[PDB]
Nucleic acid binder design. Structure first.
Length: 859
DNA sequence: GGGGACGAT
């Protein structure tokens, strides 16, 4: 057991800390307390009874409006722009089943609609179910909710379904997203929303009494929210006989949802797309005639799969080609000069259209971009100036432009080098050729060793099936699969359903507001039950941050954390920021970890965006504090009317920056309504009196990211110029390093040796994707595992019983006493939410902490 | 010295 630096405090400081704590100790309307004990007092049976009478607006309908809408419905049926927008509607496959669906919804609680892309189930089925109730004279009783996996989906489908009715947005069709809503009318309505929005509207309406039909769509992607909702529907529907809900899916393992609902009726409806011809590796090399020129069991493990297949079709391709499939180099994207030649192939033959190339990640997207842009080969020189190459990646701006979606200049063909982002999220219309390497990346979490890893793996058959349809949106296309058909048969059906890949601490908490107290029993109900060990780890963390007691029941703090749209750890961090008057920078850090970072990473300027993140970090050695600095600079550029030049100079997305600002202001209102803030402005002066005390911020950042700590021990000089080598290990002993995109990557001369992080990930090394340098005094205050004693013959104070620091008994005795009242303050404030009076008893304890943390300020 | 798309009244 080794000892760290000294964390003792001067006499005059402790004398004042003891003064403030003694001052805080002699102190003597909670509607929330009545709320918190009432949820625990009820069991499920009275829980269901109380919410039915609380949410009963749909028990009333208005006939004066029923008949009014019924008479106006087809007054439009007689005009010739309606009655001209409906024959085009009845050229969509779903309208042919319209009457059968009206029947199937009437006699079944749940139905399933399975349909390929282009059928228009999303666009039509809500209209069909709405127009039926209207013409029957039941319009005011019909309220339709239709979930979508992504935001961009929920809007564009709401905009076009609206124009199909000759109405502007918000009359009969509306959308409701996080931070954004153009909501439709109250009744006789269609509302497209994100799955997440419905899940939070559940805590006030847990058994869906404010809707008449629910439409879950793209459940085939098996996102966490869709499988959660279907598990939650099995609890709700026994108590809601009149609730209709129909599931929507593509043609990937559709029977799973039919089985999950006891063989509910399933509608398989037509597809409307152009035929896409599908080649494979044996078919591509048969036309291209490329060959590869420039490990101990791979050669025979591919031998074990392919030549059982090579000798199958022995007389179906030339044997010069079948030797080309014994190579482990032939399938995937190992030889990118092969994909390069395949692109040059498509340019000569195979007439007009765009090429979309699916490569696993940023690394191999760059290699062909450079091969295509500055080619070393003769035939590459010929095609260079007649290709318009757009690389597509979530960390690149091309996806937020108009160019990649527009058709290329005359005499040039557009080539898109993308990740899987172009599979469902981003869609390009003029694509007619797809080169699917079959290789992508994914994160797997090892539950046994607690390491997240990003690994290059093979694509599913579901992803390959989805990428085929990308080329068939405008004309007959071709999809080039760079892997043998034998490889396809070892490929899994669908990607690992992500409920088996997530940390569940947020979902365990969310379920407590819905009176689902046993997460082992409930999560076993889902289509694919999560590992019970991953459930225990969620419970154990929630117990550590004390959102639950040791019995498992949820605490008054846990209820607030369950009510904030953010993971419970930083939800607690946002909460601490209100107590400590640094709302603006901490909410920027929490909003930036919950969603994306604003910085683009355009190809070739890797070095330039390293220098610019360091400039906006302002030497504060924090990837989280630097994003707030970026928001401060982004705000100032709007006051300066220099927004565009600022975002260009500095490689930021104006789109995500504004989304970060909207979520921060969302955190402000929610705490203000929870009686934690006197004002709903994240920039208000009272909530920000400490917003530039930098040791104050790392303490609150550490309070949220604890216990993800790491200690640095070494630093290099010889013999470069800037970047240093770090021997640094997390608290578990595992040696790690700053991720190169992190601000602290390769830096030297840190004021402190200890760091906190949000995410550690293994790709090339154990990397910390983000880090803020913290001080031992801050960790000891807010962390746990704090004991005082002697070891060599040396007085110490430890944190997590991992990091032991020298300090005398005089300071250790009071910070232990300071931790005890900080804990009894937080519990009272969660039970009786009120903002801290600036000249009150509680502020004295706050100032006692500001004083101890101020001792680590820059000299 | 390197970043597989989603998302929360």
């Amino acid at each position: 057991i080794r000892l760290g630096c000294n964390v003792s405090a001067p006499s005059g400081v402790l004398e004042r800390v003891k003064e403030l704590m003694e001052d805080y100790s002699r102190a003597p309307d909670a509607k929330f307390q009545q709320q918190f004990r009432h949820l625990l007092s009820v069991n499920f049976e009275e829980f269901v009874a109380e919410t039915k009478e609380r949410n009963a607006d749909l028990d009333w309908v208005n006939p004066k409006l029923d008949e009014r809408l019924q008479l106006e419905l087809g007054q439009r049926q007689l005009e010739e722009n309606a009655k001209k927008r409906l024959e085009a509607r009845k050229k969509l496959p779903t309208m042919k089943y319209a009457d059968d669906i009206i029947q199937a919804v009437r006699e079944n609680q749940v139905i399933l609609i399975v349909g390929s892309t282009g059928c228009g189930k999303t666009t039509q089925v809500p209209q069909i179910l709405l127009d039926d109730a209207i013409s029957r004279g039941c319009a005011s009783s019909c309220r339709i909710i239709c979930t979508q996996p992504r935001r961009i989906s929920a809007i564009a489908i709401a905009e076009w379904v609206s124009y199909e009715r000759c109405e502007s947005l918000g009359n009969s069709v509306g959308y409701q997203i996080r931070l954004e809503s153009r909501k439709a009318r109250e009744r006789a309505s269609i509302t497209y929303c994100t799955t997440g929005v419905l899940l939070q509207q559940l805590q006030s309406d847990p058994l869906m009494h404010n809707l008449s039909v629910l439409i879950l769509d793209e459940i085939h992607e098996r996102s966490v929210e869709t499988d959660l909702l279907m598990g939650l529907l099995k609890v709700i529907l026994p108590h809601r006989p009149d609730l209709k809900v129909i599931l929507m899916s593509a043609t990937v393992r559709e029977q799973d949802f039919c089985d999950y609902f006891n063989n509910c009726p399933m509608f398989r409806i037509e597809g409307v797309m152009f035929p896409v011809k599908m080649l494979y590796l044996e078919d591509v090399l048969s036309k291209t005639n490329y060959e590869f020129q420039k490990p101990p069991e791979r050669r025979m493990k591919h031998e074990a799969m392919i030549e059982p297949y090579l000798r199958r079709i022995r007389n179906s391709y030339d044997s010069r080609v079948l030797d080309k499939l014994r190579l482990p180099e032939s399938e995937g994207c190992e030889d990118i000069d092969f994909i390069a030649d395949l692109v040059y192939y498509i340019c000569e033959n195979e007439p007009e259209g765009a090429i979309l190339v699916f490569l696993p990640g940023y690394d191999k997207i760059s290699q062909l971009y450079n091969i295509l842009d500055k080619p070393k080969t003769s035939k590459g020189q010929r095609w260079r100036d007649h290709m318009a190459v757009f690389p597509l990646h979530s960390l690149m701006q091309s996806g937020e432009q108009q160019a990649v979606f527009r058709r290329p200049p005359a005499g040039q063909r557009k080539v898109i080098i993308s990740t899987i982002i172009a599979e469902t999220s981003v869609t390009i219309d003029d694509v007619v050729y797809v080169i699917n390497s079959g290789r992508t990346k994914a994160t797997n979490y090892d539950i046994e060793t607690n390491i997240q890893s990003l690994d290059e793996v093979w694509v599913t058959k579901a992803n390959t099936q989805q990428r085929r349809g990308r080329a068939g949106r405008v004309r007959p296309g071709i999809c080039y699969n760079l892997f043998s058909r034998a490889r396809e048969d070892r490929m899994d059906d669908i990607p690992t359903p992500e409920i088996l890949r997530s940390k569940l601490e947020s979902i365990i908490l969310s379920l407590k507001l819905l009176h689902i107290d046993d997460p082992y029993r409930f999560l076993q109900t889902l289509i694919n039950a999560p590992n019970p060990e991953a459930i225990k780890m969620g419970v154990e963390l929630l117990k550590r941050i004390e959102a639950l007691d040791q019995t498992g029941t949820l605490t008054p703090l846990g209820m607030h954390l369950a009510k904030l749209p953010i993971d419970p750890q930083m939800g607690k961090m946002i909460l601490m920021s209100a107590l400590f008057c640094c709302l603006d920078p901490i909410t920027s850090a929490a909003a930036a970890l919950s969603f994306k970072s604003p910085f683009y990473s355009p190809l070739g300027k890797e070095s330039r965006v390293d220098e610019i993140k360091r400039r906006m970090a302002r030497n504060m050695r924090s990837d989280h504090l630097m994003v707030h600095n970026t928001i401060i600079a982004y705000r100032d550029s709007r006051y300066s009317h220099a927004e565009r030049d600022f975002c260009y100079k500095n490689f930021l997305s104006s789109m995500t920056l504004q989304q970060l600002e909207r979520m921060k202001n969302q955190f402000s209102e929610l705490l203000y309504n929870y009686k934690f803030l006197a004002s709903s402005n994240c920039k208000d002066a009272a909530s920000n009196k400490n917003s530039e005390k930098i040791p104050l911020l790392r303490a609150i950042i550490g309070a949220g990211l604890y216990p993800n700590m790491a200690h640095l021990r070494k630093s290099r000089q010889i013999k470069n110029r800037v970047r240093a080598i770090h021997t640094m290990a997390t608290d578990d002993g595992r040696r790690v390093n700053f991720h190169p995109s992190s601000v602290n990557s390769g830096e030297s001369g840190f004021d402190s040796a200890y760091f906190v992080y949000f995410q550690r990930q293994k790709s090339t090394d154990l990397f910390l994707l983000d880090s803020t340098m913290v001080f031992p005094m801050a960790l000891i205050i807010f962390g746990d595992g704090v004991e005082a004693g002697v070891t060599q013959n040396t007085p110490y104070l430890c944190v997590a019983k991992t990091y032991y620091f020298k300090c005398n008994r005089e300071t250790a005795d009071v910070v232990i006493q300071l931790r005890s009242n900080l804990e009894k303050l937080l519990l009272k404030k969660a039970l009786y939410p009120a903002p801290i009076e600036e000249n009150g008893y509680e502020k004295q304890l706050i100032k006692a902490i500001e004083l101890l943390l101020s001792l680590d300020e820059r000299l």
